[PDB]
Copies of this chain bind each other. A is one copy, B any other.
Amino acid sequence: AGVASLSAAIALMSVGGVAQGIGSLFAALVSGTARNPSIKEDLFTYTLIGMGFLEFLGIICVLMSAVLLYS
């Protein structure tokens, strides 16, 4: 009955892309901040919005996995 666990693991094997995207996000944040500190409030203002999508995708990437563990 481990096929459910296998499906959950496979569905969980996509958080690496979310993490790479978040790393690129914060890397560009830090770069544009060192280039222009006075505009930090905007780079952050957009950064959170990006997280507002990426984390949501990651949440799905967990949720469906959990579902595949039980149903």
Q: CB < 8 Å: which of B15, B36, B47, B64 contacts A8?
A: B64
Q: CB < 8 Å: which of B3, B17, B58, B61 contacts A1?
A: B3
Number of copies: 7
Chain B residue nearest in CB terms to A65: B64
Q: Which residues of A1-45 have CB atoms within 8 Å of chain B's CB atoms?
A: 1-40, 42-44
- CB contacts (< 8 Å) of A20 on chain B: these are 16-21, 23-24
Q: CB < 8 Å: which of B15, B30, B55, B68 contacts A46?
A: B30
- CB contacts (< 8 Å) of A43 on chain B: these are 30, 33-34
- CB contacts (< 8 Å) of A16 on chain B: these are 13-18, 20-21, 61
